[PDB]
């Protein structure tokens, strides 16, 4: 199985499997069953502003997620990035749904790492702005059946049949080139993101979710994850 | 051949092929016969520092080369980089050496895409700052005979015999992402460089120049390169 840790912006409520009763907001540690959650709004089709940041100097893998004229949700938790997350990775966005539909079009998102040469000693950056995810972006190794393009979006779905979209589908988003991180140069890698989604309320109780992970530079799509795996993790556990 | 636009910093006056009687820094649209040269101090190992703009509001594609305590060569040339060069590419580094022995260390590059999603509306960026070229760095494609870590060193040559570094080595530096160019949502992508090399005297007459091109996504070391070519040409026209 692949090393992997994912921030969840979820829709569904999987109590089954262990999210709380309500679409909120996550974190998770190599498994779906999180570390801690918060209250999310979970709105109709509006759009967009997530943050996600991790400084070891303070080590909070913090996170907010905010509709304008709506709150910020933290869901920061205390994890040490040394010992959970590849020597080199490869970032990307994730979306799933399964029995359910959810519309996730993601319209831009960001990075920025800054890692530790010789502390004060001018830090290696990766940081891009992709306002502009054309038809066919190529330093995307997008997995599954996320599509891109036609407009500025980057539709993690199968998607155009009105954007109702065709339930049961999964695309991930893996950003092409990776970043060291693990701890060896130490791990002070403010790598942050800005995650400006769109989940139109597609008149069918809105639910999977989407995500914003950090794995191997190998991947897929884990054994099937139609559903309620969240893209990313092979089994429920 | 594939379609690359180069810098030389050439150190062997390549007296029959285009180059002028002293050791300069040009610039190649492709043909190692350059478009603009300028005067050069070869010194002996200092550090470096090299720059390169192209904005497409002012059209001219820049490059000055200055030694702490040295001057500068602003080597610019006026050349539309709508129809010459593709729409994604490969950024990155090249030398060689042939028959006369230098040093070609690079310790630090950067890079800073801005490509005109609406030219106001937030354009996409592929930032960097490699201070610190490790042993195991993973976003490079380095092809030929170049060698990196040990130190935080990028050696395009073949070395470590006392810093003798073995003539008729040439080393490449391609870097992994693509960019958006040719023009089509137009070209103002001002790509910064930033090329702080290191060549020693190797008490040896030093020539033959790094270079800094930028290429199509495939390519390879054209033809043997071990002397004039430069690392990038398949044919010395
Ligand atoms: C039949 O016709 C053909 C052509 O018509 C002839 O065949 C050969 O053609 C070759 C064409 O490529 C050509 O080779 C190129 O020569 C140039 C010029 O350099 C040398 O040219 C002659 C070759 O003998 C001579 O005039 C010189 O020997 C000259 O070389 C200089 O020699 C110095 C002392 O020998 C030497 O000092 C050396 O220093 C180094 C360290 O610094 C050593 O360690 C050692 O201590 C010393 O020997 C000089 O450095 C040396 N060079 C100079 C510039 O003075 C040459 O530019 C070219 O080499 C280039 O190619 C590489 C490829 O990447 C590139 O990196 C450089 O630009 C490099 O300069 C070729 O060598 C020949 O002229 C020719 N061969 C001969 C023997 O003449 C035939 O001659 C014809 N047959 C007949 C019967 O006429
Ligand atoms: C082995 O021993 C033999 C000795 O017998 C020698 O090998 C060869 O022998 C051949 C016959 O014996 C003979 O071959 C000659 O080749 C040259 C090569 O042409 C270029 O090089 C000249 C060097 O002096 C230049 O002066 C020329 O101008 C010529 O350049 C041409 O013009 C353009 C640039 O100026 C270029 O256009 C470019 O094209 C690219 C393509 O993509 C770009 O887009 C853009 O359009 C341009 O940049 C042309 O392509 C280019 N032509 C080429 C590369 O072919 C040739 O000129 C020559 O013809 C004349 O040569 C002299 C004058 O130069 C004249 O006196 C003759 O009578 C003849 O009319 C021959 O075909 C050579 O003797 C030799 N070749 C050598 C040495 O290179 C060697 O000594 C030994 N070794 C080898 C490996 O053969
Ligand atoms: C076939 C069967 O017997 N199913 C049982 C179920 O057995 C396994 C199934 O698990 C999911 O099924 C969903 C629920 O778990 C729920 O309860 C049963 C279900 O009958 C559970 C345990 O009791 O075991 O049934 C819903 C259907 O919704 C009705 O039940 C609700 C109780 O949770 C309750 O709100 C209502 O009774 C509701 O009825 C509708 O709602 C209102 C509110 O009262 C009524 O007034 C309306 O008249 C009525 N209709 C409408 C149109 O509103 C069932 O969906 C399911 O697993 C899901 O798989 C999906 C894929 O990812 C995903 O949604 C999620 O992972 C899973 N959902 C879960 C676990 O809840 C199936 O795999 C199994 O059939
Ligand atoms: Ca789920
Ligand atoms: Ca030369
Ligand atoms: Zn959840
Ligand atoms: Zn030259």
Redesign the interface.
């Known amino acids: 199985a692949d090393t992997i840790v994912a921030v969840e912006l979820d829709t569904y409520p999987n109590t089954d499997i262990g999210d709380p009763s309500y679409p909120h907001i996550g974190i998770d540690i190599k498994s779906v069953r999180s570390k801690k959650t918060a209250k999310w709004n979970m709105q109709n089709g509006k759009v967009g502003t997530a943050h996600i940041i991790y400084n070891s100097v303070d080590k909070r893998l913090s996170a907010v997620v905010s509709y304008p004229n709506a709150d910020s949700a933290t869901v920061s938790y205390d994890v040490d990035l040394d010992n959970v997350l590849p020597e ?1 990775v490869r970032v990307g966005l994730s979306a799933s749904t399964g029995l359910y539909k959810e519309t996730n079009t993601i319209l ?1 998102w960001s990075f920025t790492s800054k890692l530790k ?1 010789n502390s004060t ?12 995810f ?1 038809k066919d972006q ?2 995307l190794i997008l997995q599954g059946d996320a599509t891109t393009g036609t407009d ?1 979006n980057l539709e993690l779905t199968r998607v155009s049949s009105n954007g109702s979209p065709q339930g049961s589908s999964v695309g991930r988003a893996l950003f ?3 970043v ?1 991180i693990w701890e060896s ?1 130490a791990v002070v890698a403010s790598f942050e993101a800005t995650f400006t989604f769109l989940i139109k309320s597609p008149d069918s109780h809105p639910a999977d979710g989407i995500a914003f992970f950090i794995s191997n ?1 190998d991947s897929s799509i884990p054994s099937g994850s139609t559903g309620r795996l969240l893209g990313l993790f092979p089994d429920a556990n």
Chains 1, 2 share one sequence.
């Open positions: 080199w831009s040469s000693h001018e830090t290696n950056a990766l940081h891009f702005m992709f306002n502009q054309s190529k330093d500025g092409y080139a990776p060291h140069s530079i």
